[PDB]
């Protein structure tokens, strides 16, 4: 899969993920949702090798949902990201590694803070104000470095994200067919249906 | 690395340089390449440094447990057999080249051991990148019925040849002397021919030279 972006603002985390699924010669789909809800206040977007991405995402989703039922409690975004990192770090020395890069956007209900975690297929974890995987950062980080403020509203975060996507649409060779955008805050997860 | 071993009147002696090099840079200028196996059994290590240390320690541990079990002082042939069988099992993937020497109830012994598990018996041996320089000296001056004072001289001369003429070897000379009816004497830094000269200038900085963003106290104490 191609472009996955993340930005943590004042009171929410915004994840933007491309809609295209290309299998070599043809674009098979232009409405693909590259994300799974792990818990009511934690979302994970993903990109990497075909098959492995969804298999990994759904496997993580199942384990976090299992934890939720057992303890009657939602794990913190930090805890979920550490669990995901370990699974990827375990994977890299396997017989056949998961080639999957993820962003984990969550709202910590205890601390009342949005949190964004970037984890690559090796199990390299970093907490960031904004992040990306693959070539997405090469185009967008100069704009984010310039315009980003920690006290941005959700609407300002979306406007900065539009500028990032516009730059991607101008300078990237591949047609990624636009992005699905989702917001993670104190009220949970919702999709911005017009972008 | 230059390591050497040779026998004398009523003993055996080991020699080694003290330089560790990764690629073309000197990682360590004073490392110990003469390894302890038993109180009177020692091992010079060449090849991959971790492998030579690790294999001597494992066999040294097993030799100690064997010694306790049998109520006998360990033999060099036991260390030799245990090392070669272990190295043979790993088909050279443990890249240890070793010179094993010691004294035991049987007498004094000197063996070499290669990474694939072949062993040799000798009166004088050398291993490592400096072996050819060291062996030139040993072939020129080694003789039968050497005295201890002559043997230490020859062993250090063999290691020095490696130090000066091999880029892989350097720094100081370590020696270990194992004589019959005596405690083994481990002579670390037996020779020190490569002390650095005094520098031209002092590079101590004025205080406040470095720019600092933040200062904080780290809590290392128990809760």
């Amino acid at each position: 899969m191609d472009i996955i972006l993340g930005i943590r603002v004042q009171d929410s985390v915004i994840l933007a993920s491309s809609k295209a699924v290309t299998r070599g010669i043809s674009v098979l789909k232009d409405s693909d949702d590259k994300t799974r809800q792990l818990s009511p206040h934690t979302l994970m977007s993903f990109a990497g090798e075909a098959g492995d991405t969804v298999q990994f995402a759904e496997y993580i989703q199942a384990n976090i949902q299992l934890y939720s039922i057992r303890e009657d409690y939602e794990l913190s975004p930090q805890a979920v990201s550490s669990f995901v990192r370990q699974e990827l770090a375990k994977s890299i020395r396997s017989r056949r590694p998961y080639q999957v890069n993820v962003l984990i956007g969550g709202y910590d209900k205890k601390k009342n803070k949005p949190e964004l975690y970037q984890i690559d297929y090796l199990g390299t974890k970093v907490e960031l104000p904004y992040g990306a995987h693959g070539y997405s950062g090469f185009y967008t980080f100069s704009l984010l470095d310039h315009h980003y403020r920690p006290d941005m509203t959700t609407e300002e975060g979306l406007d900065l994200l539009k500028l990032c996507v516009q730059e991607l649409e101008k300078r990237m060779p591949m047609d990624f067919k636009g992005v699905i955008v989702k917001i993670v805050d104190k009220d949970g997860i919702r999709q911005v249906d017009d972008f | 690395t230059t390591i050497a071993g040779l026998v004398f009147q009523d003993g055996v002696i080991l020699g080694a340089d003290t330089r560790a090099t990764n690629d073309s840079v000197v990682a360590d200028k004073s490392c110990e390449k003469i390894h302890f196996i038993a109180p009177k059994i020692y091992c010079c290590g060449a090849g991959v440094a971790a492998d030579a240390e690790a294999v001597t320690q494992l066999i040294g541990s097993n030799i100690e447990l064997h010694s306790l079990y049998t109520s006998r002082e360990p033999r060099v042939v036991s260390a030799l057999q245990m090392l070669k069988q272990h190295l043979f099992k790993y088909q050279g993937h443990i890249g240890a080249y070793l010179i094993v020497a010691g004294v035991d109830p049987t007498g004094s012994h000197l063996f070499s051991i290669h990474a694939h598990g072949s062993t040799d018996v000798g009166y004088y041996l050398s291993l490592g990148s400096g072996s050819l320089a060291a062996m030139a000296v040993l072939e020129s001056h080694w003789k039968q019925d050497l005295t201890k004072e002559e043997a230490i001289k020859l062993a250090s001369d063999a290691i020095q040849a490696g130090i000066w003429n091999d880029l892989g070897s350097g720094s100081n000379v370590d020696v270990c002397v194992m004589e019959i009816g005596k405690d083994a004497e481990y002579l670390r830094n037996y020779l020190t021919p490569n002390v650095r000269e005094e520098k031209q200038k002092s590079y101590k900085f004025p205080r406040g030279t470095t720019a600092v963003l933040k200062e904080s106290i780290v809590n290392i104490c128990d809760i």
Binding site: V126, G137 | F205, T210, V218, D222
Partner: protein, 204 residues
């Protein structure tokens, strides 16, 4: 492709009079791309400090592994682990992965709580111990650090002088390495106080 230089970064440790210093840069990258300027490479288990350079997933993994092991050590021994003992634990742990190693360059620094003796050590990726009197270097700019340390270092520096020496060694080494920099941290360690200082440096 080379796992030890994908993420980049450096660690240096030095001894002084009744003190040790350990320092590291803050960069994490994906080759040419700078990813994080807050990736600290120094950790501590009681009073023993461990710096780790190399592949960042293994840096994180080994930190979590030694935290695990030093916690269990403490519960069983009823005392904090000492630098000399921890050095052997790092060496053992690395060598047990001899034929599938962690791509890292660990550095140990600390003061023995009973003897008061300053201690530093470095390792290769499979656990070979370098127990230097003077200094230990590690990472993608280890050549540059060797060059700085070998000229700048003198023995028995006081804590506040040692801070200047190790800082200038790290900074100027990092500025000659593409994959290091983006900030830096210096720990000054005495027998019962530890000061942590973030340095100001060029951000390219």
């Amino acid at each position: 492709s080379d796992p030890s230089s994908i993420n980049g970064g450096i660690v240096v440790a030095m001894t002084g009079k009744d003190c040790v210093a350990i320092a590291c840069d803050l960069r994490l990258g994906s080759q040419s791309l700078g990813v994080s300027n807050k990736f600290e490479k120094i950790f501590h288990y009681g009073h023993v400090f461990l710096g780790i350079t190399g592949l960042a997933t293994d840096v994180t993994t080994l930190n979590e592994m030694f935290r695990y092991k030093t916690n269990l050590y403490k519960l069983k021994e009823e005392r904090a682990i000492e630098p000399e003992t921890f050095t052997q634990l790092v060496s053992s742990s690395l060598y047990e992965r001899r034929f599938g190693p962690y791509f890292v360059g660990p550095v140990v620094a600390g003061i023995n709580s009973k003897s008061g003796k300053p201690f530093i050590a470095g390792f290769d990726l499979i656990g070979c111990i370098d127990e230097a009197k003077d200094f230990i270097v590690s990472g993608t700019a280890s050549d540059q650090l060797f060059g700085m340390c070998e000229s700048l270092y003198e023995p028995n520096l006081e804590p506040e002088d040692l801070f200047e020496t190790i800082s200038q060694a790290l900074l100027n080494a990092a500025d000659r390495d593409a994959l290091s920099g983006w900030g830096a941290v210096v720990y000054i360690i005495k027998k019962d106080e530890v000061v942590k200082r973030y340095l100001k440096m060029r951000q390219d």
